[PDB]
Design a binder for this molecule. Sequence first.
Ligand SMILES: CC(C)(CO)c1cc2cc(NC(=O)C3(c4ccc5c(c4)OC(F)(F)O5)CC3)c(F)cc2n1C[C@@H](O)CO
Ligand SMILES: Nc1ncnc2c1ncn2[C@@H]1O[C@H](COP(=O)(O)OP(=O)(O)OP(=O)(O)O)[C@@H](O)[C@H]1O
Ligand SMILES: Nc1ncnc2c1ncn2[C@@H]1O[C@H](COP(=O)(O)OP(=O)(O)OP(=O)(O)O)[C@@H](O)[C@H]1O
Ligand SMILES: CC(C)CCC[C@@H](C)[C@H]1CC[C@H]2[C@@H]3CC=C4C[C@@H](O)CC[C@]4(C)[C@H]3CC[C@]12C
Ligand SMILES: CC(C)CCC[C@@H](C)[C@H]1CC[C@H]2[C@@H]3CC=C4C[C@@H](O)CC[C@]4(C)[C@H]3CC[C@]12C
Ligand SMILES: CCCCCCCCCCCCCCCCC
Ligand SMILES: CCCCCCCCCCCCCC
Ligand SMILES: CCCCCCCCCCCC
Ligand SMILES: CCCCCCCCCCCC
Ligand SMILES: CCCCCCCCCCCC
Ligand SMILES: CCCCCCCCCCCC
Ligand SMILES: CCCCCCCCC
Ligand SMILES: CCCCCCCCC
Ligand SMILES: [Mg+2]
Ligand SMILES: [Mg+2]
Length: 1173
Amino acid sequence: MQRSPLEKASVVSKLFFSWTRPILRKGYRQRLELSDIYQIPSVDSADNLSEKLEREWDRELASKKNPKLINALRRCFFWRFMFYGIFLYLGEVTKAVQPLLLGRIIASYDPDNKEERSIAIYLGIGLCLLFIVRTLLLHPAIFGLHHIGMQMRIAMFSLIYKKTLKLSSRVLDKISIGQLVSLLSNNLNKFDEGLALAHFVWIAPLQVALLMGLIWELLQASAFCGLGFLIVLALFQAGLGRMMMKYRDQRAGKISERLVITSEMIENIQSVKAYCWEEAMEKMIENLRQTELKLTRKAAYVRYFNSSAFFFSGFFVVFLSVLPYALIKGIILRKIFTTISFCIVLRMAVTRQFPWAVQTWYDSLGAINKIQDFLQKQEYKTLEYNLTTTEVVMENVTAFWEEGFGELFGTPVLKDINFKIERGQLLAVAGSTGAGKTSLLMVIMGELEPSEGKIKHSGRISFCSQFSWIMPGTIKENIIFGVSYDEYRYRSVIKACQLEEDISKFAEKDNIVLGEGGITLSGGQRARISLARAVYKDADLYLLDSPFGYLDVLTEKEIFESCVCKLMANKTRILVTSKMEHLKKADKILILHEGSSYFYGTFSELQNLWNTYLRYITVHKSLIFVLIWCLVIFLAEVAASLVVLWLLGNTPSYAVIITSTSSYYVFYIYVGVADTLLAMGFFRGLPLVHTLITVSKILHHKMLHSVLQAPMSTLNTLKAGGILNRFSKDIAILDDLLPLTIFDFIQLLLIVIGAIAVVAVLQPYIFVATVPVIVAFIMLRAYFLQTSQQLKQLESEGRSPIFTHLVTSLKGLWTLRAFGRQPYFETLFHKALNLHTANWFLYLSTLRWFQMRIEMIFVIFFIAVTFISILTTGEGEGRVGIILTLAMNIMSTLQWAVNSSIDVDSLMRSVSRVFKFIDMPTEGIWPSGGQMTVKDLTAKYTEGGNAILENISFSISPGQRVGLLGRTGSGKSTLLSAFLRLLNTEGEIQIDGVSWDSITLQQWRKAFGVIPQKVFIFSGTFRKNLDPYEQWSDQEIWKVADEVGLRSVIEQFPGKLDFVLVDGGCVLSHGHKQLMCLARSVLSKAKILLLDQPSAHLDPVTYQIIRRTLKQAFADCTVILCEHRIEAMLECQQFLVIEENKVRQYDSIQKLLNERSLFRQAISPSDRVKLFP
Ligand SMILES: CC(C)(CO)c1cc2cc(NC(=O)C3(c4ccc5c(c4)OC(F)(F)O5)CC3)c(F)cc2n1C[C@@H](O)CO
Ligand SMILES: Nc1ncnc2c1ncn2[C@@H]1O[C@H](COP(=O)(O)OP(=O)(O)OP(=O)(O)O)[C@@H](O)[C@H]1O
Ligand SMILES: Nc1ncnc2c1ncn2[C@@H]1O[C@H](COP(=O)(O)OP(=O)(O)OP(=O)(O)O)[C@@H](O)[C@H]1O
Ligand SMILES: CC(C)CCC[C@@H](C)[C@H]1CC[C@H]2[C@@H]3CC=C4C[C@@H](O)CC[C@]4(C)[C@H]3CC[C@]12C
Ligand SMILES: CC(C)CCC[C@@H](C)[C@H]1CC[C@H]2[C@@H]3CC=C4C[C@@H](O)CC[C@]4(C)[C@H]3CC[C@]12C
Ligand SMILES: CCCCCCCCCCCCCCCCC
Ligand SMILES: CCCCCCCCCCCCCC
Ligand SMILES: CCCCCCCCCCCC
Ligand SMILES: CCCCCCCCCCCC
Ligand SMILES: CCCCCCCCCCCC
Ligand SMILES: CCCCCCCCCCCC
Ligand SMILES: CCCCCCCCC
Ligand SMILES: CCCCCCCCC
Ligand SMILES: [Mg+2]
Ligand SMILES: [Mg+2]
């Protein structure tokens, strides 16, 4: 890409932000292509900012007694912050002194006022220079604040990731994905824009002091009667701001809880559809949203009064200040308007700048102190040797997962374990399910500090987890995992893993871009890729945690005797296996049972013993009625104001002194108080803010409902972080920023329209005088938005790489520390930050260019108007200036209205992106016998893609158990998924004589009982996981738990049937998750059931449970059992062998094994003698 134009630009061009001109010119005619996005400035790269803040934070920890993160920021961002502060203050001083010139010029129109007319010509030049100075002094400061804020946010986001990669093992159970995502999203765009307002904490007191002294000149001692009203208002306003944060802190927990469950269900949406749980998930989320929206409304009601305090202050501040002065001595309209022209600034300084500054300081310091807490949590210690005899030895090791139980010294996970392997002994770990084998490996890696005993080994280690983890990218990226690509070693590993036959089927033959979690791949393909990654890296110790889970006996034997016993014969390798043949070739065998070492020794001695605003308003029927209500009342107030002005001019000592020629001040006075006469009270504001929030409820409900029913092919294209972005950030915008910003835009629009209308009816030339300015505003806005809309979308979509990477890293954290590849993912995360920074910085600069031009055009028109006004005043009664200057006083408010319109349209991008999900396509006693017939079935995942199954035809009888076998990656799960119709299919499969299309899709799916390959467990109670619909009493739940053997594991935890699972059920072992899904299927009594790999890792002793419950509980229902272990084939009668995208049925097992010699020769002897008598 091109270098940033900021590097080499003119100083005059940099001041005016003219370097953003090319992209606006390019972005008006056609769409913005990738070749246009400029590179980030070198002083903005995440690496330099991370290095800087890390160094200061390291020094801060090493020096002070009490470290504070805010202190570390104060040394690397303060000087530029203050340097821009003095320029921002000088911009505000220029604004509070304007009435000394504008009011002195307006008074010159009257012939009776000789004094201020003699010098009016000099004041025109002075006022002209005053406007020009302010334009070059106020905007470049704000952009500097935005630039500093972007640097701070990037530099803090880096340290968040630097700490995340090093978090201790036991703190992960308390820090869920939703906590980080909420932490990032809340500050993702608020922190940068916040710094533009942070300076008014110390600017506003100076503005109040200066203005009060300047008003003291006019109203000698009565000005303080008007100030006391603002002081009471400020105290009341600060009280509401304090109250708002109470409602916002109570909400943080329940929104983080939602963001966890939302991500859990949607990354496993395949299983949710199979279970027909759409309604259950929607109700669960809506119960969480109810309390969240309740707190949002109670916050929004308070924030409305916090916002509207400015508009309902105009008439009162003016009235309460001039009344004690007018009562004692006569007041001239000349001083009434000049007092108004000071209050218009004093009100905004103390009601709209100061409280916003204080609130921003509240928020930013709260976020910094929360990240300071994050940076000081318990950290993974790595105190271990780096050189030794390479002899892995352990002795007297015990461990507890729960910190409190180990602090007291609740069965310990391990007790008194010891072993020793010198330089290549294959130590086969075995035992029953849940006895603890994964924990033994985590103790070795240092993921679980043993309270007692010692463990010694070499530094280099490799790890193949019992649960596969596939990072995004090609197969090659997963295998090498961030090192140099060696051709010879790469081919040898793939050949050893026998991935050649399976990778050859892919279109690109090596490079298929895998989604997060490897959903594109089969169960066994992910397992072998995880194995290949471990094999590729050279290490002293290899921890192979049961890679032979989803593989058939043929591939298991080949991969074991070609990759484990042949490729790495001279490397120590701990292997977790249950097959007896693997213990034969092991030099050491460690049998574990309930954490105790049952046996240790050699096997020999073992044997010896634009249509978006319209649709956003139409989505709710009450919103249009409230808007009409706000318009009807507006017309009444305009009509009342119009007749009041008309009846004062027709009328004729008195307290207020006016002359015939000075009467024109009445209209100038009105413009300064029109904001209060047209202000929306609590009878119009609260209904609008209330109704704008219920729209967000309906939009969220519709969006989640539409997503849950989308076809699977559309769901596989979208990334996990794109979904997480649109649920966290987008919905937060629709609740927090959209309602009140729309209210401000509508309020300002009403004020401008009413002020123009009533003035135009009375003096029908001010409307003509303002048309050339309004048209210029609308024309410039329509030109800028053609590029701002596209820039906003590019930045909005640029947030997804950050969330995908964070989810991927946190899910795979156990593999990262085993390999030691933290720096590789640190620089990869910095690429995502720089990618987001480029679009955000570019958008933020083009917006600043518009803000400068929208003010410059007003300045140009005003300077033009003052000279014609000054020059036209002849021998008294300067009518031309009376009409023109009034026309330009209203545009000082329309400029604010235009800026608010830009903010509304920028935020309306969120609405459109949520609507984009609603439009997604929708894929849309009888089962007495269970007899089904398949005719000419064809299956293919993507439309127009490769046909995984072609013209399949077979039939099964009622009450018949059918086996479904075949080599890994042949199509077994595809065939079982074709029954439920998750992927696009052709043909027909009738049950009991009714066709597919004769019955609705959801009624069809409900006939089946499914056990998916990827066990799904969401955060919640045990009884909620076993039946979300709550249609079973606890008596039946226990009666099933006893039959499936979940008794002992459930009662261990403190809350029996009440324990809240976390991290997708990390507390349970893998074998307990299989039993959990088994109980879930048993409870849902279905006349037909599809079992895809029930006994994934269950040892033969645990398999007795599987065969018992399938024999007893599933008495007469037809079973389609997909299994890999040969012992399971005894039960099923018919066998469906899948190969070459085709299916062929056999009635006897002896014919099946006679056909395939190589299949038969691999069978373990205990199962070979079982099948062959
Ligand atoms: C001079 C003195 C009165 C006493 O030494 C002082 C200076 C000072 C500066 C900062 N913050 C900053 O210079 C930066 C900043 C951080 C966070 C931001 C942000 C700006 O503005 C926001 F509101 F957006 O949050 C630019 C980095 C601060 F926080 C507290 C400070 N104190 C009080 C002292 O007691 C602190 O120890
Ligand atoms: N993170 C954890 N926190 C607390 N308890 C846990 C955790 N992981 C497992 N356990 C519990 O500790 C015991 C053993 O843990 P587990 O990982 O270690 O067995 P395993 O070796 O994976 O079993 P299997 O052979 O069935 O896969 C079980 O009772 C299990 O429920
Ligand atoms: N969503 C998908 N899009 C494209 N191809 C897919 C998709 N899901 C799976 N495949 C491919 O289809 C083939 C078979 O899928 P898969 O269910 O069928 O294997 P399997 O035999 O069920 O696995 P295992 O024996 O490990 O349980 C594989 O080549 C796999 O990569
Ligand atoms: C903190 C800083 C900004 C405070 C500034 C206070 C200034 C604006 C105040 C302080 C004293 C004030 C002056 C006090 C006395 C007089 C004499 C009177 O016949 C005209 C107004 C005039 C000339 C005042 C103008 C405003 C004034 C100069
Ligand atoms: C600058 C001088 C002249 C005027 C006084 C400035 C005001 C705005 C200052 C003085 C004390 C400040 C508060 C001191 C302590 C805290 C707690 C922190 O967790 C959030 C910010 C907060 C709440 C500060 C907000 C701003 C504050 C109220
Ligand atoms: C908070 C607003 C207070 C408004 C009332 C101001 C005080 C009363 C003003 C009139 C005082 C008249 C005094 C006449 C004295 C004759 C010797
Ligand atoms: C919104 C309040 C409007 C008040 C209008 C008062 C009108 C008074 C008319 C007096 C007419 C006198 C004719 C001699
Ligand atoms: C830097 C701030 C200077 C403020 C000077 C204010 C002067 C107000 C006019 C006093 C004489 C009428
Ligand atoms: C930056 C401050 C500028 C103040 C200008 C005040 C000019 C007052 C002139 C009065 C002449 C009668
Ligand atoms: C008698 C002549 C008075 C001239 C007043 C000039 C005021 C200049 C103000 C400049 C502000 C930047
Ligand atoms: C004088 C420097 C600018 C004003 C900054 C005041 C902020 C005080 C915050 C105190 C936090 C403990
Ligand atoms: C905070 C307001 C200060 C006003 C000072 C007025 C001094 C007049 C001599
Ligand atoms: C910008 C054009 C203003 C024209 C004003 C005409 C006033 C006639 C009395
Ligand atoms: Mg395990
Ligand atoms: Mg499968």
